[PDB]
Amino acid sequence: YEHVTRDLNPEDFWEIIGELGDFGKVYKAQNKETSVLAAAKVIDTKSEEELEDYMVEIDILASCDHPNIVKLLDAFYYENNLWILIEFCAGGAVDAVMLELERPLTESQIQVVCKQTLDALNYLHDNKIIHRDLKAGNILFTLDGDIKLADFGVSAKNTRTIQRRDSFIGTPYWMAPEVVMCETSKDRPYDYKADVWSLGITLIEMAEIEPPHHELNPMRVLLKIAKSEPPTLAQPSRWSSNFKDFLKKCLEKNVDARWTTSQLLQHPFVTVDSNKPIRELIAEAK
Amino acid sequence: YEHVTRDLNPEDFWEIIGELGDFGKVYKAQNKETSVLAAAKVIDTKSEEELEDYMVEIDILASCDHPNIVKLLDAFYYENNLWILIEFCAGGAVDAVMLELERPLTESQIQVVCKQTLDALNYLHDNKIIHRDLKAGNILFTLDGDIKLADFGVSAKNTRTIQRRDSFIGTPYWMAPEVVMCETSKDRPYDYKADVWSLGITLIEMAEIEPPHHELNPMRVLLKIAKSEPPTLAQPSRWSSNFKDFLKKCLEKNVDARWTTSQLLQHPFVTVDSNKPIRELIAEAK
Numbered sequence: 001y002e003h004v005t006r007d008l009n010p011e012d013f014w015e016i017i018g019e020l021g022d023f024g025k026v027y028k029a030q031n032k033e034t035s036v037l038a039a040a041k042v043i044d045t046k047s048e049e050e051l052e053d054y055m056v057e058i059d060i061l062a063s064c065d066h067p068n069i070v071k072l073l074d075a076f077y078y079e080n081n082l083w084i085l086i087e088f089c090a091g092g093a094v095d096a097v098m099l100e101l102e103r104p105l106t107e108s109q110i111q112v113v114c115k116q117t118l119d120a121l122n123y124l125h126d127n128k129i130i131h132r133d134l135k136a137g138n139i140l141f142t143l144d145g146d147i148k149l150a151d152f153g154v155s156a157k158n159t160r161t162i163q164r165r166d167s168f169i170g171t172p173y174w175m176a177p178e179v180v181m182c183e184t185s186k187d188r189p190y191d192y193k194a195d196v197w198s199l200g201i202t203l204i205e206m207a208e209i210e211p212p213h214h215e216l217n218p219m220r221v222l223l224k225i226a227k228s229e230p231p232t233l234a235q236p237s238r239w240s241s242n243f244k245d246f247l248k249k250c251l252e253k254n255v256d257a258r259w260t261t262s263q264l265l266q267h268p269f270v271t272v273d274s275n276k277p278i279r280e281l282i283a284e285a286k
Numbered sequence: 287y288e289h290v291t292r293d294l295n296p297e298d299f300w301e302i303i304g305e306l307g308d309f310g311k312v313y314k315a316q317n318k319e320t321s322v323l324a325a326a327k328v329i330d331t332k333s334e335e336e337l338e339d340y341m342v343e344i345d346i347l348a349s350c351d352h353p354n355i356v357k358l359l360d361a362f363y364y365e366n367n368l369w370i371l372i373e374f375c376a377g378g379a380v381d382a383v384m385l386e387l388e389r390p391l392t393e394s395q396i397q398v399v400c401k402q403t404l405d406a407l408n409y410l411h412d413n414k415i416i417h418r419d420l421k422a423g424n425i426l427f428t429l430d431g432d433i434k435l436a437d438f439g440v441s442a443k444n445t446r447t448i449q450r451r452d453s454f455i456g457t458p459y460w461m462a463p464e465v466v467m468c469e470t471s472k473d474r475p476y477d478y479k480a481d482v483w484s485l486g487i488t489l490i491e492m493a494e495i496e497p498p499h500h501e502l503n504p505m506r507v508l509l510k511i512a513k514s515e516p517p518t519l520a521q522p523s524r525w526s527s528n529f530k531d532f533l534k535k536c537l538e539k540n541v542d543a544r545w546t547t548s549q550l551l552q553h554p555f556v557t558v559d560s561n562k563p564i565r566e567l568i569a570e571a572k
């Protein structure tokens with residue numbers, strides 16, 4: 001494939017140091033030549049037709065070039081495994097930090113994570129990518145107090161389908177005006193706004209350690225989302241009006257009324273320019 | 287591929303009788319064993335990566351089972367050509383008939399074609415397929431006075447992307463309510479309604495031989511669609527109120543207000559059950 005190496009043993013290039021987490025396990029790896037650190041996802045594939053299922057993820061990582069999105073370092077197919085090697089963020093996932101410290105982020109910490117996460121998302125949406133699995137477990141801290149967005153395992157990339165859709169020959173007398181005007185679902189915000197709702201839930205998850213409805217039987221959670229008004233902060237006196245106002249723009253069930261990442265970047269809750277609160281957080285867990 | 291034969295010469299199975307039309311030419315073919323007739327599209331492919339571009343078309347033909355959609359009879363890859371063999375409709379395309387007779391269809395003929403075309407489209411939409419190139423040139427007459435819809439060269443099939451989208455693991459606390467409720471763009475009517483607008487233009491094309499804006503420089507046509515109110519019949523006294531009312535439900539620039547195929551099937555303009563007018567038309571061109 002475009003970005004996947006064949007016929008080579010990944011362990012002739014990358015040395016497994018340990019496990020980071022657990023369709024496989026994720027390892028801490030170290031380049032045998034350069035000492036550069038990596039997370040190595042090792043995905044067990046039965047056949048080669050399965051590689052097609054993991055290729056959109058790999059293409060997204062390979063195609064993205066943003067400070068707050070993790071980079072692809074290498075990928076290998078070898079002895080029925082797909083190895084994906086991804087840049088290493090030494091601070092760990094936001095949710096893992098909250099559980100180790102046994103406390104949520106403070107509001108000033110949430111603003112930094114929110115602001116940088118929004119930058120990542122805005123870039124994705126601009127490039128016709130929907131993340132589709134945003135949560136605190138997929139926001140990773142660097143040693144320098146910045147964040148990177150990760151895990152594009154179920155992301156959608158609409159660039160090739162937009163390319164195929166904008167393609168025609170001969171005079172299109174029968175073309176619908178919404179297709180003429182580039183107002184199909186691929187170019188419209190509608191489907192990208194699913195990420196904006198998830199940002200909102202991630203903000204509450206960072207404010208309260210666990211996401212809304214964490215106490216319910218898992219079988220009830222989808223029903224609860226459908227039935228209920230959007231969630232709010234449990235202890236709203238703890239939080240600024242700008243935090244709560246930001247949330248209301250994300251956690252809006254009317255998708256048309258819900259804000260885009262572009263609109264959200266102008267909100268005073270993300271008008272910050274220092275990661276000092278995150279540097280203080282990662283130093284405390286060290 | 288799933289539906290494409292390799293290593294076999296298509297002309298050891300199918301005999302070319304002549305040309306029907308002109309990325310290639312379309313031939314009239316005859317099965318050497320069974321005498322069954324076929325249209326043979328022979329598409330020149332440079333490499334094998336090009337087959338991927340023609341596979342959605344082939345899969346649609348192979349997967350559809352409807353009286354008013356043309357069936358796949360065979361496909362072959364041989365000596366750098368993709369052969370697609372499609373069931374034969376002995377009456378030709380609706381637009382070719384109008385040009386040979388030098389006249390449009392009558393309203394009773396349009397109702398039959400409309401009613402059967404709508405049945406085909408409704409089936410497609412139910413099965414998550416957008417045709418994307420509906421026009422009189424892709425509606426074919428059978429010897430019995432029925433129609434079949436053809437040419438899925440630029441169709442979209444959203445079944446595998448809906449399958450991939452409905453797929454998740456673990457508890458989805460971060461899932462947007464529109465994703466919970468199955469109100470993403472794949473399940474919503476919005477993008478399928480592009481076909482409904484094109485049905486409307488095809489109806490006018492059948493009423494007047496050529497589609498709206500046929501007299502303009504081709505470079506102006508997309509602009510004209512964007513700028514103008516929806517087209518109407520040029521000589522509206524010639525046509526019933528049910529024809530004109532049907533058109534208004536199709537040719538509606540507000541996509542939400544525009545009717546679905548399902549709604550259109552209940553309209554009195556398509557409440558017919560005899561193809562006698564088309565039998566009279568094809569007999570006249572013979």
Ligand SMILES: N#CCC1C=CC(=Nc2nc(Nc3cc(C4CC4)[nH]n3)c3ccccc3n2)C=C1
Pocket residue numbers: 020021022026039070086087088089090091092093137138140150151
């Ligand atoms: N799948 C997926 C995302 C993910 C996120 C975090 C994770 N565990 C984990 N991940 C990391 N760091 C990490 C993970 C990645 C890459 C997203 C796999 N890049 N950096 C650390 C770093 C330091 C201590 C502990 C860590 N644990 C394992 C997998």
Ligand SMILES: N#CCC1C=CC(=Nc2nc(Nc3cc(C4CC4)[nH]n3)c3ccccc3n2)C=C1
Pocket residue numbers: 306307308312325356372373374375376377378379423424426436437
């Ligand atoms: N591409 C594409 C659609 C198309 C539609 C019509 C066409 N020409 C054509 N097509 C047909 N018939 C036909 C074409 C097909 C099949 C859609 C290619 N099935 N039957 C006839 C039949 C009798 C006299 C003349 C005909 N001419 C050639 C191609």
